């Protein structure tokens, strides 16, 4: 079962937010969204660029093996 870190990211709108998925690997929510495999191959960055307030919410990575849920919060500048 993949690990999805951290349990909570809080950013300001317009900032970047980068979760780590550790383990076909997908990023779900219960362009601007990118997945990057790191050199080591076990760990992937699941990044949001130019975060918007509507990005706020609950996310998982799945390999169907699902990680624990994590939360994104995008505050108002």
């Amino acid at each position: 079962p993949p690990t999805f870190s951290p349990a909570l990211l809080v950013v300001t709108e317009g900032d970047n937010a980068t979760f780590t998925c550790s383990f076909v690997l997908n990023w779900y929510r219960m362009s601007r969204f990118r997945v990057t495999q790191l050199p080591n191959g076990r760990d992937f960055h699941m990044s949001v660029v130019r975060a918007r307030r509507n990005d706020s919410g609950t996310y998982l990575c799945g390999a169907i093996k699902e990680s624990l849920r994590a939360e994104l919060r995008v505050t108002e500048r």
């Epitope: 870190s5 951290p6 349990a7 909570l8 990211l9 809080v10 980068t18 939360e71 919060r73 505050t75």
Partner: antibody, heavy 120, light 109 residues
Framework: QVQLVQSGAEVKKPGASVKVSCKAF????????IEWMRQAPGKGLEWIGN????????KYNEKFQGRVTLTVDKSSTTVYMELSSLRSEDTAVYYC?????????????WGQGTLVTVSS | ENQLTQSPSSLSASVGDRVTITCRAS???????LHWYQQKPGKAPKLLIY???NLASGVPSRFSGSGSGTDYTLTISSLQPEDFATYYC?????????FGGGTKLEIKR
């Protein structure tokens, strides 16, 4: 068994620095930001900043004007709040706190508070 | 900063009464990010209500929260002895985080 345990009461002269510890127990240290607040007798509650062990990111209240530094020791799951150039108006109980799943900004877990008295 | 102002600053009531406290934000907050704490003398605050209306763990259902935009309330609909304390609101809508000044619930006599 989530717990935040802070260091003990401190007395300081004006101009000095304090470093207050908050040691996190009972969960994966990197999963949550640690938030800092203080409560002065007649001011109520003031937010100081936060530090995320996940990525070492810090946010600060601009009111502190770069007088606060937050640092971490991952080895001992401890976040440090260092407050420099202390003034009388810095006398307060300092708290660390964290959220929990789904609290959306609400602080579920709190350290016991550290009294810092600043005075000549 | 988004200033929060609580009303009233103090109020006196009895065991069994119902009271409502108000939190007003200088700027509109998404209601997910507005919370309430109870503080008793010599203790850290304890989260009471998160996201406007959700009771925190172990909080009795005589507490309720309501609101949105800039206007929020906390109600205790049948006071118990333990309930006399200071209540604060807090916003996690924008940095810096802010808290209200507090409302102190006292015993009427």
């Amino acid at each position: 068994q989530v717990q935040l345990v802070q260091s003990g009461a401190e007395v300081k002269k004006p101009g000095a620095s304090v470093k207050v510890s908050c040691k996190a127990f009972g969960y994966t240290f990197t999963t949550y930001p640690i938030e800092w607040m203080r409560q002065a007798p007649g001011k109520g509650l003031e937010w100081i900043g936060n530090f995320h062990p996940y990525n070492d990111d810090t946010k600060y209240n601009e009111k502190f004007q770069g007088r606060v530094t937050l640092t971490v020791d991952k080895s001992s799951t401890t976040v440090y709040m260092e407050l420099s150039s202390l003034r009388s108006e810095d006398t307060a109980v300092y708290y660390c706190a964290r959220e929990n799943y789904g609290s959306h900004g609400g602080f579920v877990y709190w350290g016991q508070g550290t009294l810092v008295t600043v005075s000549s | 900063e988004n200033q929060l102002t609580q009303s009233p600053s103090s109020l006196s009531a009895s065991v069994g009464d119902r009271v409502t406290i108000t939190c007003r934000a200088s700027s509109s907050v998404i209601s997910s990010y507005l919370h309430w704490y109870q503080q008793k003398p010599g203790k850290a605050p304890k989260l009471l209500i998160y996201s406007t209306s959700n009771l925190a763990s172990g909080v009795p259902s005589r507490f309720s929260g309501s609101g949105s935009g800039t206007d929020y309330t906390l109600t205790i609909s049948s006071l118990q002895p333990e309930d006399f304390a200071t209540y604060y609101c807090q916003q996690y809508n924008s940095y810096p985080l802010t808290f209200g000044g507090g409302t102190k619930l006292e015993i009427k006599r």
